[PDB]
Every structure is written in C-alpha cells, then in structure tokens.
Homo-oligomer: A and B are copies of this chain.
C-alpha cells in the first residue's frame, strides 16, 4: 500500500521540479528583456 503511494509522490515531486526549472528560467529571461526594453525606451 505504501510503495505505490511513494511512487506517486516521487512522480509528483519530479513534475514540480520541472515546472520550477521552467518557471525560473523563463522568469529570469523575461526580467532581463524587460530591463533591456525599458533601457531602450529611456534611450529613445
């Protein structure tokens, strides 16, 4: 009974880790691009 619950837990944790990786990567990229675009606006 416990073993399958542990397997499901492992799967759900692994899914969450991938979501976190994607979220941080894209958030950092979009923050950098926002910095660049507002810098360009100030230049303009």
Q: Which positions in A face B, CB cutoff 8 Å?
A: 1-28, 30-35, 37-39, 41-42, 44
Contact = CB atoms under 8 A, between A and B. Distances in A.
Contacts of A33: 42
Interface of A is mostly: helix
A38 B32 CA distance: 14
Nearest to A44: B17
A20 B10 contact: yes
A7 B26 CA distance: 13
B37 A27 contact: no
Contact of A41 (B7, B14, B35, B37): B14
Contacts of A5: 1, 8, 16, 19
